[PDB]
């Protein structure tokens, strides 16, 4: 179990430092998108929610 708790509800973009994708083999039951907050809190998010794609598309434009 790699996710203490998936969030149902949208996280504000401005809170998110970055994302990483974790697989079964990473020690997860199901694959998970992990958002790391500015404070360093891991928030697992549902890969199928448009609000998750939506944050990742900003981390992509503002990226590096």
Description:
The protein has 64 residues and is of the alpha+beta class. The protein has one domain. 19% of the residues lie in helices and 27% in strands. The chain is built from one helix and three strands; from the N terminus they run βββα. The protein has a three-stranded antiparallel sheet with strand order 1-2-3, covered by helices on one side. A hairpin with a 4-residue loop joins β2 and β3. The PDB classes it as signaling protein.
Quick overview of this protein structure:
Interacts with TNFAIP6 (via Link domain). This protein is α+β, with helices and mostly antiparallel strands and 64 residues long.
Can you count the helices?
Answer: 1
Strand content: 25-35%
- The shape, in one word, is globular
The total tally of domains equals 1
Radius of gyration over alpha carbons? 11 Å
DSSP, total strands: 3
Sequence of secondary-structure elements? EEEH
Compute the separation of the termini in Å: 30 Å
Give a short account of the largest sheet.
3 strands, antiparallel
Range of helix content: 10-25%
Spatial ordering of strands, largest sheet: 1-2-3
Category from helices, strands and their pairing:
alpha+beta
List keywords for this structure.
monomer, 64 residues, alpha+beta, 3-stranded antiparallel beta sheet, globular, signaling protein, CCL19, Chemokine, monomeric
List the helices and strands and how they pair.
Elements: E1 16-22, E2 32-37, E3 42-45, H1 50-61
Antiparallel strand pairs: 1-2, 2-3
Keywords: Chemotaxis, Cytokine, Disulfide bond, Inflammatory response, Secreted, Signal
Disulfide bonds: 2-28, 3-44
GO molecular function, one term: CCR7 chemokine receptor binding
């Amino acid at each position: 179990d790699c996710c203490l708790s998936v969030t149902q509800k949208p996280i504000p973009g401005y809170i998110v430092r970055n994302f990483h994708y974790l697989l079964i083999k990473d020690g997860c039951r199901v694959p998970a998108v992990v958002f790391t907050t500015l404070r360093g809190r891991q928030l697992c998010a549902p890969p199928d929610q448009p609000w998750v794609e939506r944050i990742i598309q900003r981390l992509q434009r503002t990226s590096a």
